[PDB]
Design a protein around this ligand. Structure first.
Ligand SMILES: O=C(O)COc1ccc(-c2nc3ccccc3c(=O)[nH]2)cc1
Ligand SMILES: [Zn+2]
Length: 208
């Protein structure tokens, strides 16, 4: 059911997604071990992910959440990096895309910082890096991230340095409690609460 539509670099939509990607890069406490060393990206392509069935799955669940939370879906646009990106865009998010060992239990994790999601493109901890060169900081190989529409509903706040969401909540928020520059991370426990809106193809760029 999925089609991918290329956005032109001239399109205001391309430009606003690129800006969110670039402006949410930060330094990581691993010095770049997982995701590589970079301050910005080379954006090669941005595609809209269009799947009627998956869209309707997401909006159905969004209405349920909304109606459980005084007509407030608490919808965000967040990044997701995954070795399963090509399955997610065709079949949607589900229990197979969960981070079983994540800090907030088995769920599907999203980030405000694009560079945090970049650490997962080649797997947990960056895995063994790119398939071609076995390099977590590869500057040649093309990487992909998703920029996703995510329904948080009532989110349980965890202050901090598939399972079920906590009773009375639709999600968990991991609030950064030590690194003052880190943005929040989020976890949902139902795949229907995210839609993989944009597929972004990019390279990390070697600092000069
Ligand atoms: O590789 C596996 O075994 C299961 O596959 C995955 C797939 C994705 C992520 C993942 N974790 C995150 C944690 C915090 C913030 C953002 C993210 C993110 O973007 N992706 C972890 C494991
Ligand atoms: Zn490579």
């Amino acid at each position: 059911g999925t089609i991918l539509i290329d956005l032109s670099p001239d399109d205001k939509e391309f430009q606003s997604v690129e800006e969110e990607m670039q402006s949410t890069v930060r330094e990581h406490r691993d010095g770049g071990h997982a995701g590589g060393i970079f301050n910005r990206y080379n954006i090669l392509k941005i595609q809209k992910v269009c799947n009627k069935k998956l869209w309707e799955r997401y909006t159905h669940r969004r209405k349920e959440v909304s109606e459980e939370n005084h007509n407030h879906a608490n919808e965000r646009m967040l990044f997701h990096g995954s070795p399963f990106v090509n399955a997610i865009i065709h079949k949607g998010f589900d229990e197979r895309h969960a981070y079983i060992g994540g800090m907030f239990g088995a769920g599907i994790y999203f980030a405000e910082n694009s560079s945090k999601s970049n650490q997962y493109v080649y797997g947990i901890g960056g895995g063994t890096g790119c398939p071609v060169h076995k390099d977590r900081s590869c500057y040649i190989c093309h990487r992909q991230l998703l920029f996703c529409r995510v329904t948080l509903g009532k989110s349980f706040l965890q202050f901090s340095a598939m399972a079920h969401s906590p009773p009375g909540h639709h999600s968990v928020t991991g609030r950064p409690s030590v690194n003052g520059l880190a943005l929040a991370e989020y976890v949902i426990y139902r795949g229907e609460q995210a839609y993989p809106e944009y597929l972004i193809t990019y390279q990390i760029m070697r600092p000069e």
